[PDB]
């Protein structure tokens, strides 16, 4: 999922576009007051009409817990494997973002191109500012 | 050229302001049913009503499915028509009520017309210019982007926004490429290099689209035909997102879900708003359910509920049962396997069996459709065999007779071929006779 | 929309003394049931008591769903009216009690009051600072009116709303703070020098004068089930449309109840109850009735209206017979409204109203014939014959349905009784209960 | 003004200090022996010593079985947990009925824990990261540390943040000038709002403005929490609340009920026993109420036989209104109240009795008092005679249409004509059955 | 190979002439002349391909040759034509409806034929040189590739350069690039460099260096069923559903679009339609819903020719409460033609046993063959067919290369048929668990 890129495919093939994929790709960058974009923006209009971005949280979980720890006494390989599985750099970089001054340092003062950056910013946004935490 | 039990029926064959004739449109006889279906076709073309149900009942091999396909042919290829069987509503992913509602929404069409302003052609130049007073701490402050386009019998240089240079660099548009610029959105997209830039490298993955015709700038008025279920399934799933959930759901199995009433209500109100604006218009269609006796009483009750909706199409049902127990019940004896609550909400069209000359005419029509030459005495023997055993048995035995005539190097079917086909292939009655006379587990 | 079965009913037709007029608001006859439904409507509009079960019973084609539609039309907007059938409870995704709980909680509305600030002005300067990957976005906005000039700070959602329907430094925009809605009213400056990519053909409006910022008070209605689905998980707003809300736990529901009571105490929100209508209630198991018997006793319970047409039939899920298909526990805590059959005058008035709704002009003799055939057969058959005779009427090119059109429509289409007569006469041609048929005619 | 629904005229069992029930107090009329037995059961629950005790409320329809359970729940108070169920709720399509029954068993055992939190809070003044040597080295994150400058009232601290904390910091989208709240127990960060030391009226994102937090940046506070054992079970079963990859992905997947093994329950019991032995926890057993117990089948009854013999299970209160009925899931056994005899042997049946005319009359009087209606004496006598003749519930539910019909005639009292008109407009079960018997086409 | 001697592997096509007249013994088929002529007629119907949606029914007593006839039709059909063979019990799935499973089985039996051209340049990479411009907008490449005979120099586009950064080459890997298509693949490492890096690794593989002409031309022909196109266009990466079966109720609109595009490709001339045969063995356990769906689905233009085999008498249709001939409803039997099969006599049984002994590499004497023929006359035929193969092992254990009458008698005494087991059960039924669960364990009363 993380490493997937929108590569090109040749035209002479049996995999063509469905009508639903055409409906999807029409409203990617379409502006407002167009019939197709407004016909495919039901959820955004329902979000704006219902004043949902200023609603409050009514539910909080009672107990929050980390995953169960597994220990093997007298072995360092299991600790490295557990630290690699729990704190995988690829997934944790996918669920976060790089700071802006760090991006400026690697793009300009280090010569790294934009396409060689790790994948960032795949965490889904919450409904409100209140819905981002349990405290 | 492929034929399968049909495709000799071309419309109902009615004259205008009148009734059916005898032999027209591949139909022989069945005059009252054809007139009733023509009245139903005119009602559908009137485009005013909602949720009218028609059940046509009769014996087997009478032409109910032929009548439904003739209705769908008479309506045209633009009005929606969803054929269905009663066994198809029992799915293991979602409840039967949701499948019935999905097939209800599949039969309502929409016609949307738009206008597109298009810049396209081969890129001739791409000069991102730089401003008179640049700001410190930055590089190449862009004031505008000048891009030259070249197409067939016309070229035109443009003067674009500085923001579109970011999308140009994103989509890797270089020289010699063909691009596609619409007016309001910006959003440059690239189709490929020209055919004139193909023979400078031996090996390249990239295809070479030819240079497009017409001028650089043009207006095309397009018309898009979608159904209400297409809008529901497009709004229900999210668009191309930038989260793990939408990418993960795109690569997994597309499991069906229970579409809520709220989404359909919002789709209905935005469709009504744009219908009032004068852009779109509504084309209701036909939902055809063959073998309606296979439904149980829960689907019948939900059909009673859904036939009173404001957006339901016309429903056409067909059945061959008599006084038969309704499925899902133990002691409800009802005509055609349909409960009386549903029967009270519909109209019944009666279909009648044929006689010998109509059987002969139908056999002759199916023979001349299949490009077969039949002798007259062979035709009479086939008609006598058909009226003795079955119409479908005489229709299905025509191809082995043609194969046996082709084996003996001739282009005509005579009495010996139909006798050999009678000897080789049996029917239901003779099979039942040889099963009842043998006790060897036959 | 289209013309439905109950499209001619706008309200219940009652005066200020809750006495039904004989012919008003599309409802004729049935004075006792209409008075009782008006009493139930006033009980709902009072909003004081909760958890009352009302049962509507009678023969088929009597006006039960018509009465429910009249109640829902007299209820008005902003009060939830959940209308479901009996077969919609059974799902492959939720349990029966969970679906019943969701159907119960969809009929309670919460009216939430919000304080917002409206900003309308002319855009002067836009500065947008984004990172290299385009993720972290911030900037400043300089907007003006004819009197004031203010610099605002922008977040991510504001920048996303600006970069869609792109504003170009001189457009007049309107921003709602609490809703986050950006509306481009038009362009006032009418700049000459423009890039040749976008249209920018917006209408010419004036620059607004006076105060830039205005406080306002807005209200909106949100159902309880919406709040449970939203607070259930991370992406509950998608689950409000996709219907993938699988078995919400009880802790969420009681915390939502506590928060709703807190909001009522603070004066922020008020509770608006509604009506849940369950048509064809006899298609429910005894476990659903056992759950309803306890769900009716809660404070957060709506007025439940049930309709049925069964006599003394078998309760589903058991092996005994009960009146209306309901056990005596549910019948003890419910109040029954009984509907009665019609005369010929009420049938004539109903047919005249339905002909006026469908824009069909009838002669007096055609109306008398339709009244007679609706006395003999059912009312729904004579209601359905009107549009068919109408299409026959323009098939002979006159816009008035005469007696011969009704006679031809009676000839082409059958009743329930005539089809039963034909099946009992020609039983050998239809498949019976044991799968026996005679296809051959010799 | 207030909402009333079939209850809420009942505030308790209404006993004195000796356990003797009054004839009419606490919203109850009659049923003296059942109320005294329920008071004994209430004292047994408040003793907090027993485990796996069960009683059964047997009686006819409309006699006060659910009313006694709600009176028990009101007499216990809100601190003692109380889980009301219907018998049809145990059949789920996501998990077997045995696991649902065990879940509802564990949902009725409360716990009160004094919890200590290490809290860093203040106003963000400096947010400065520093970079790694090779960001494209494949292993290790892009940054190495983040320097955060926090300012509270009468204090100021600087912190060098771990990157794993910084993921939760930047997921909250904090900035310079925001008041934050870092919980060191889990690493969770709450962004409170913009500081009020700067300007206010130059924002467009309807933010909330908050003063500086009092006291020092680093704090320790004690928090009293109320938590059931089922909450701990579902927290450990689906772990959300860490800062790891698995805990992050646990919040995004669709939740589903799973068969929680007994090993997790033994581990949770061991940890809770350690917390009790440390002196920071107190165990509050509760009541599980299963109304309409005849909807259960033989498999749930057979599992309930085992589940009542554990050492954790709370007091279970059942109810039924069947005389001699075959158990569901069987063919030919016949048992009282639809409850099999092996389960009946472990119960304590509390009998419930029907009412009289005077009790019906005073119940009608009190329910008319609660609904804020004025009833004449002759109309009250007619309503009591109707309640004896047809049903108590039918006379109960005819009060509000009578009030509506009185209000439409511009009156406050309820008179005999309104009762007669409500009789003529609204029917009961017996008259509807008599109409259905003399009907034409299955009316 | 990966094929052992199956139940009927001796049947290679129907034994017919050029005038559709069956020979008495040819191509492994003995007797059953009328059914063989009917199967030849059906085979010519399939090979003509202009008739769509026909249902035939092969009905007969058990151990007669209905499945043998279907195997003969499949063998005589040849390659590159789809022949689907499913049982009646396979469509009762847990993740798919019976209608969807039947639709997938219908669409697996009709395919399209696509022919394409390939210009393969297969060889070992010697050295790659990349030229970058000062602007960097384009990259030029000089590729030095070789076979065992000769080596040329090729110029490369930037898309080649980006395609060779992925699945990277290390000057000695064997690749093959197309000219017109430009498909890039990495076959593996050459055998000449196998003693270089001292440890292989994870993904690497050693292949021989290709020899001969560097640039080859090859025309290949593909046959794709419609179900594969449905599965491919249903998802984003659909071939995993093609190999794991996790399709899950593909919608109807994609099927309509695929049918329309197949008709468009046929009209243009890109592809041609190859029909096929669908064989449903043991059709008598299908539900009535599946029968109604078959009745409706047989009338479409994209329908194959359905062959159904059953051996039931007048038996109960499943899902109903009545009986019917062949276990099939009468409306399904109306739209069908029945090929009946007849039982054998002594001579055809002897010929079948001789052919089966020839196939299983077993030599029998004349007396042993006559004894097995008498046993197959009295008992069934499959009993004698198994008796041959166990008597061969008995004869080999007796250190003899031929099967005699004593070995056949020993195999007859050791292994029982149905009738002797029925008699032994009915004589000592107190020792067996009956339908009430009563059994006597102890031997002393
Ligand atoms: N009036 C007719 N004219 C020509 N062919 C007919 C007519 N009626 C029926 N047929 C033929 O009969 C065949 C089967 O009829 P069908 O519609 O299946 O009847 P049913 O649906 O009642 O079984 C069709 O192939 C059709 O071509
Ligand atoms: N008083 C009335 N006013 C308007 N329409 C009526 C009236 N009485 C009956 N109808 C018509 O008769 C039918 C009543 O059937 P339905 O609405 O299903 O309720 P029920 O099943 O209780 O009779 C409806 O189609 C309705 O249009
Ligand atoms: N002793 C009582 N005093 C006042 N109201 C009572 C009494 N007993 C029963 N009721 C009322 O009778 C109704 C039915 O009692 P409930 O226990 O809820 O149902 P059931 O008795 O059928 O289980 C309740 O609304 C309750 O308010
Ligand atoms: N005509 C035949 N020629 C050769 N072998 C045959 C013939 N008919 C049947 N057999 C053999 O008989 C065996 C069982 O026959 P089978 O086809 O399974 O019977 P059924 O069709 O009743 O299932 C098969 O192994 C097959 O090889």
> Residue B14 Cα, ligand 1 centroid: separation in angstroms?
18
Q: Cβ atoms within 10 A of the Cβ of E343, count?
A: 16
- The percent of chain B in helix, strand and coil, each rounded to the nearest 5, is 35, 25, 40
Look at the alpha carbons of D411, D415, D420, D426 in this order and tell me if their dihedral is positive or negative.
Answer: positive
How would you write E113-140 as a 3-class SS string? EEEEEEEEEEEEEEEEEEEECCCCCCEE
E94 interfacial to chain C (CB closer than 8 Å): no
Cβ–Cβ contact E136 with B under 8 A: no
Going by their DSSP bridges, the two strands C275-279 and C303-308 should be labelled as: parallel
Contact B243 A122 (CB under 8 A): yes
d(CA C81, CA C377): 34
Q: Identify the three-state secondary structure at position C64.
A: helix
Nearest CB partner across the interface for B230, out of A19, A28, A36: A19
| E39 and E15 Cβ atoms separated by less than 8 Å | no
Within B320-365, strands assigned E span 323-325, 333-335, 346-350
* Residue B118 Cα, gap to closest chain C Cα (Å): 10
Q: Is B244 on the interface with D (CB under 8 A)?
A: yes
> For atom 25 of ligand 3, which residue has the closest CA?
D6
How far apart are alpha carbons B417 and B419 in whole angstroms? 5
Cα torsion B122, B125, B128, B133 to 10°: value is -150
Q: Is the dihedral of CA A101, A103, A107, A109 positive or negative?
A: positive
Centre of ligand 1 to C-alpha B67, Å, is: 8
CA distances from B255 to B252, C246, E234 (A): 9, 14, 11
Q: Distance, CA C5 to ligand 2 centroid (Å)?
A: 9
Which residues in chain E are closer than 8 Å to C435, comparing Cβ atoms?
317, 320, 322, 324, 329-330
* Sheet with C81-85: strands ordered across: C81-85, C275-279, C303-308, C53-57, C334-338
Rounded Cα distance between C201 and C380, Å, is: 55
What is the distance between the alpha carbons of residues E274 and E46, in angstroms, rounded to a whole number? 10
Q: B375 exposed, middle or buried (CB, 10 Å; 0-12, 13-18, 19+)? A: middle
Q: Is D93 on the interface with B (CB under 8 A)?
A: no
Q: Are E229 and A14 in contact (CB under 8 A)?
A: yes
> Which chains contact B through at least 3 pairs of Cβ atoms less than 8 Å apart?
A, C, D, E
> Taking CB atoms and an 8 Å cutoff, what residues of chain C touch A132?
none
The 3-state secondary structure of B41-55, one letter per residue: HHHHHHCCECCCEEE
Tokens of A90: 């690829």
Instruction: Consult the annotation and say whether D61 binds a ligand.
Output: yes
B65 marked as part of a ligand binding site = yes
Binding site of C, by residue number, is 58-65
**What separation, in Å, do the N-terminal and C-terminal C-alpha atoms of chain E show?**
58
Q: In whole angstroms, how far apart are CA D215 and each of A108, A135, E261?
A: 43, 20, 73
List the residue whose alpha carbon is closest to atom 6 of ligand 1.
B63
Nearest CA in chain C to E322: C434
Closest CA to D6 of C40, C49, C329: C49
Residues of chain D in contact with residue C313, where contact means CB-CB under 8 angstroms, are 442
DSSP secondary structure letter of residue B29: S
Pocket of ligand 1 (CB under 6 A): B 5-6, 26-30, 60-66, 320, 362
Q: In a 3-state reduction of DSSP, which class is residue D210?
A: strand
Report CB contact under 8 Å: E324, C437.
no
State in Å, rounded, how far the first CA of chain D is from the last one: 40
Q: What is the 3-state secondary structure (H, E, C) of B200-213?
A: CCCECCCCECCCCC
State the Cα–Cα distance between residues E200 and E334, nearest whole angstrom.
Answer: 66
Output the CA–CA distances (angstroms, integers) from residue E211 to B151, E143, E148, in the order listed. 47, 19, 5
Q: How far apart are CA B232 and CA E251, in angstroms?
A: 14
B-chain residues near C420 (CB < 8 A)? 323, 335
The residues with which C322 forms a beta bridge, in sequence order, are C313
Q: Which residues contact C261 (CB under 8 A, 6 or more apart)?
A: none
Residue C399: HSE in the Cβ half-sphere, 13 Å Cα cutoff: 2
Residues 6+ apart with CB under 8 A from D24: D362
Rg (C-alpha) for chain D, rounded Å, is 30
3 state DSSP class of C321: strand
Number of alpha carbons in the 13 Å side-chain half-sphere of residue E122: 19
Q: Is E324 on the interface with C (CB under 8 A)?
A: yes
Q: Residue B423, SS3? A: helix
| Helices (H), ranges, D155-226 | 163-171
| Angle between the N-to-C axes of helices C379-395 and C344-357, in degrees from 0 to 180, rounded to the nearest 10 | 40
For residues D360 and D374, what is the distance between their CA atoms, to the nearest angstrom? Answer: 17
Q: In DSSP terms, which residues pair with D283 in a beta bridge? A: D111
Decide if D422 contacts D402 (C-beta within 8 A).
yes
Q: Which two tokens stand for residue E360?
A: 């299983």
**Nearest-5° Cα angle at C326, C325 to C327:** 130
d(CA B297, CA C87): 9
Three-state secondary structure call for residue C137: strand
- Bridge-based pairing state of the strands E305-310 and E277-281: parallel
Q: What are phi and psi of C321, to 5 degrees?
A: -110, 145
Rounded to 5 degrees, φ, ψ at B217 are -110, 125
**Chain C residue numbers touching A31 (CB-CB < 8 A):** 164-166
Residue B340 assigned as binding residue: no
* Phi, psi of E230, deg, nearest 5: -65, -45
**What are the φ and ψ backbone dihedral angles of A65, each rounded to 5 degrees?**
-135, 145
Give the residue on C whose Cα is nearest the Cα of E334: C439
* Chain B nearest CA to E154, separation (Å): 7
* 3-state secondary structure string across chain A: CCCCCCCCCCCCCCCCCCHHHHHHHHCCCCCCCCHHHHHCCHHHHHHHHCCHHHCCCCCCCCCCCCCCCCCCCCCCHHHHHHHHHHCCHHHHHHCCCCCHHHHHHHHHCCCCCHHHCCCCCCCCCCCCCHHHCCC
- DSSP code of B416? H
Task: Quote the minimal CA–CA distance from B177 to chain C in Å.
Answer: 19
H or E element that contains D100: helix D97-106
What are the angstrom distances between the C-alpha of C68 and each of B33, C337, D301?
Answer: 37, 12, 42
Q: Which of B226, B235, B244 sits opposite A43 (nearest CB)?
A: B235
CA A71 to CA D233: how far, in whole Å? 21
Nearby residues of E426 by Cβ (< 8 Å), 6 or more positions away: none
Residue D367, both tokens: 């329910």
Q: Identify all chain A residues contacting D231, using CB atoms and an 8 Å cutoff.
A: 61-63
Determine whether the interchain pair C92/D93 forms a contact, defined as Cβ–Cβ distance below 8 Å. Answer: yes
Residue C151 bridge partners (DSSP): C142
Token pair in block for residue B157 = 């240089």
Q: Which of C371, C318, C307 is nearest to C56 (CA)?
A: C307
CA separation for the pair C335, C53 (Å, rounded):
6
Q: Which residue of B lies nearest to D254 if distances are taken between CA atoms? A: B245
Rounded Cα–Cα distance for residues D64 and D71 (Å): 10
Question: Does chain E reach chain B with at least 3 CB pairs under 8 Å?
Answer: yes
| Stated resolution in angstroms | 3.1
How close does chain A come to B176, measured CA to CA in Å? 18
C314: which 2 tokens? 């078998």
For ligand 3, what atom is nearest to the CA of residue D319? 23
Q: Kindly write down the DSSP assignment for every residue of B129-196, as one continuous string.
A: EE-SSPPTT-S--EEEEEEEEEETTEEEE--B-STHHHHHHHTT--TTEEEEEESTT---EEEEE-GG
* β partners of residue B129: B144
Which of D291, D321, D443 comes nearest C294 by C-beta? D291
Q: Classify residue D204 by its DSSP letter.
A: S
- Let me know: does C200 contact C194? Beta carbons within 8 Å: yes
State the distance from the centre of ligand 3 to the C-alpha of D419, rounded, in angstroms. 22
Contact assignment for B428 to E100 by CB distance below 8 Å: no
Yes or no, beta carbons of D227 and A61 under 8 Å apart? no
The total of other beta-carbon atoms located within 10 Å of residue B326's CB is: 22
- Is residue C111 within 8 A of residue C221, CB to CB? The reply is yes
Q: Count other C-beta atoms under 10 Å from residue B440's C-beta.
A: 10
Half-sphere CA count of D21, side-chain side, radius 13 A: 20
Which residues, 6+ apart, have CB-to-CB distance to D102 below 8 Å?
D260, D307
Alpha carbons D296 and D217: distance in angstroms, whole number: 56
Alpha carbons C180 and C170: distance in angstroms, whole number = 20
Give me Rg for the CA atoms of chain B. Answer: 31
Write the burial class of residue C209 (CB in 10 Å: 0-12 exposed, 13-18 middle, 19+ buried). exposed
Alpha-carbon separation of residue C23 from C12, C13, D84, D256, E179 (angstroms) = 10, 8, 49, 55, 83
Q: Which atom of ligand 3 is nearest to the CA of D352?
A: 21
CB B80 within 8 A of CB B286: yes
Q: Please check whether residue C165 touches A, CB under 8 A.
A: yes
* Rg, Å, chain A Cα set: 22
- How far does the centroid of ligand 2 lie from the alpha carbon of residue C69, in Å? 10
Which residues pair with residue B350 across a beta bridge?
A: B57
D188/A133 Cβ within 8 A: yes
Ligand 2 near C341 CB (within 6 A): no
Q: At what angle do helices B398-407 and B356-369 cross, to 10 degrees?
A: 50
């Amino acid at each position: 999922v993380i490493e997937r890129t929108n590569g090109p495919k040749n035209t002479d093939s049996l995999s063509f576009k469905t009508i639903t994929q055409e409906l999807l790709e029409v409203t990617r960058n379409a502006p407002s007051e167009g019939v197709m974009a407004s016909l495919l923006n039901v959820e955004k209009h329902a979000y704006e009409r219902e004043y949902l971005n200023c609603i409050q949280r009514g539910y909080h979980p009672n107990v929050s817990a980390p995953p169960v720890t597994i220990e093997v006494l007298g072995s360092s390989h299991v600790t490295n494997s557990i630290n690699n599985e729990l704190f995988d750099p690829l997934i944790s970089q996918a669920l976060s973002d790089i700071p802006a001054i760090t991006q400026y340092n690697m793009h300009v003062k280090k010569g790294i191109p934009v396409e060689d950056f790790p994948k960032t910013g795949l965490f889904p946004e919450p409904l409100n500012k209140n819905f981002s935490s349990n405290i | 050229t492929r034929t399968a039990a049909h495709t000799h029926i071309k419309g109902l064959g009615l004259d205008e302001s009148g009734v059916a004739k005898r032999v027209e449109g591949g139909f022989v006889g069945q005059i009252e049913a054809r007139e009733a279906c023509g009245v139903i076709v005119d009602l559908i073309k009137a485009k005013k009503m909602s949720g009218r149900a028609i059940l046509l009942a009769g014996g087997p091999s009478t032409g109910k499915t032929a009548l439904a396909l003739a209705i769908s042919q008479e309506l045209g290829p633009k009005v929606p028509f969803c054929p269905l069987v009663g066994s198809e509503l029992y799915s293991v992913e979602v409840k039967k009520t949701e499948t019935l509602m999905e097939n209800f929404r599949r039969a309502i069409g929409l016609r949307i017309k738009e206008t597109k302003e298009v810049y396209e052609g081969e890129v001739t130049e791409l000069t991102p210019e730089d401003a008179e007073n640049p700001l410190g701490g930055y590089g190449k402050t862009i004031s505008h982007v000048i891009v030259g386009l070249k197409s067939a019998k016309g070229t035109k240089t443009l003067r674009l926004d500085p923001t579109i240079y970011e999308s140009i660099q994103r989509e890797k548009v270089s020289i010699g490429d063909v691009i596609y610029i619409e007016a309001n959105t910006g959003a440059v997209k690239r189709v490929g290099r020209s055919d004139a830039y193909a023979t400078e490298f031996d090996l390249e993955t990239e295809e070479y689209v030819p240079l497009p015709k017409g001028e650089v700038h043009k207006k095309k008025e397009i018309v898009q035909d979608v159904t209400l279920h297409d809008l529901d399934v497009a709004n229900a799933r999210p668009q191309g997102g930038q989260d793990v959930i939408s990418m993960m759901g795109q690569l997994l199995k597309p499991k069906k879900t229970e579409i809520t009433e709220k989404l359909r209500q919002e789709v209905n109100k935005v469709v009504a708003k744009y219908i009032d604006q004068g852009v779109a218009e509504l084309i209701p269609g036909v939902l055809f359910i063959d073998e309606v006796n296979m439904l149980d009483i829960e689907i019948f009750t939900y059909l009673n509920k859904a036939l009173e909706s404001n957006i339901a199409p016309v429903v056409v049902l067909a059945s061959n049962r008599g006084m038969t127990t309704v499925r899902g019940t133990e002691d409800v004896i009802s005509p055609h396997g349909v409960p009386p609550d549903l029967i009270d909400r519909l109209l019944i069209v009666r279909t009648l069996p044929y006689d010998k000359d109509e059987i002969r005419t139908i056999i002759e029509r199916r023979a001349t459709v299949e490009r077969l030459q039949v002798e007259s005495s062979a035709l009479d023997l086939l008609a006598t065999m058909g009226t003795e055993t079955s119409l479908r048995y005489a229709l299905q035995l025509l191809a082995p007779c043609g194969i046996l005539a082709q084996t003996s190097n001739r282009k005509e079917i005579v009495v010996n071929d139909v006798n050999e086909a009678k000897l080789l292939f049996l029917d239901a009655k003779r099979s039942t006779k040889i099963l009842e006379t043998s006790a060897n587990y036959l | 929309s289209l013309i439905a079965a109950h499209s001619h009913i706008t309200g219940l037709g009652l005066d200020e003394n809750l006495q039904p007029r004989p012919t008003s608001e599309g409802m004729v006859g049935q004075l006792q049931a209409r008075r009782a439904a008006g009493v139930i409507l006033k009980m709902v509009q009072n909003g004081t008591i909760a958890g009352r079960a009302v049962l509507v019973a009678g023969p088929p084609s009597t006006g039960k769903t018509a009465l429910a539609m009249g109640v829902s039309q007299s209820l008005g907007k902003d009060v939830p009216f959940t209308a479901i059938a009996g077969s919609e409870i059974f799902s492959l995704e939720l349990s029966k009690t969970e679906a019943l709980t969701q159907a119960f909680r969809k009929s309670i509305g919460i009216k939430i009051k919000e304080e917002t600030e409206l900003i309308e002005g002319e855009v002067v300067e836009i500065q947008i600072d984004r990172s290299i990957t385009g993720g972290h976005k911030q900037g400043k906005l300089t907007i003006k009116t004819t009197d004031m000039e203010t610099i605002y700070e922008l977040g991510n959602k504001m920048i996303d709303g600006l970069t869609k329907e792109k504003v170009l430094a001189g457009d007049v925009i309107s921003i709602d703070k609490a809703s986050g809605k950006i509306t481009k009213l038009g362009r006032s400056f009418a700049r000459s020098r423009d890039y040749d990519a976008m249209g920018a053909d917006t209408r010419f409006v004036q620059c607004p004068e006076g105060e830039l910022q205005k406080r306002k008070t807005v209200v909106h209605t949100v159902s309880l089930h919406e709040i449970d689905v939203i607070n259930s998980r991370t992406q509950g707003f998608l689950a409000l449309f996709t219907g993938d809300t699988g078995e919400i736990r009880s802790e969420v529901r009681d915390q939502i109840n506590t928060k709703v009571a807190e909001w009522k105490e603070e004066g922020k929100a008020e509770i608006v109850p509604g009506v849940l209508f369950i048509d064809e209630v006899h298609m429910l198991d005894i476990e659903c009735f056992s759950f309803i018997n306890r769900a009716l006793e809660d404070e957060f319970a709506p007025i439940v209206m049930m309709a049925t047409n069964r006599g003394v039939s078998k309760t589903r899920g058991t092996n005994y017979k009960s009146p209306h298909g309901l056990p005596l526990d549910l019948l003890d805590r419910s109040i029954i409204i009984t509907t009665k059959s019609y005369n010929e005058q009420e049938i004539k008035t109903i047919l005249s109203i339905r002909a006026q709704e469908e824009e069909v002009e009838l002669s007096s003799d055609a109306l008398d014939l339709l009244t007679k055939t609706g006395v003999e057969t059912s009312l729904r058959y004579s209601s359905n014959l009107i549009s068919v005779a109408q299409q026959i009427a323009m098939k002979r090119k006159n816009n008035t349905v005469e007696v011969e059109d009704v006679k031809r429509a009676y000839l082409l289409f059958l009743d329930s009784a005539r089809s039963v007569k034909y099946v009992q006469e020609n039983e050998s041609q239809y498949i019976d209960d044991q799968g026996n048929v005679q296809i051959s005619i010799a």
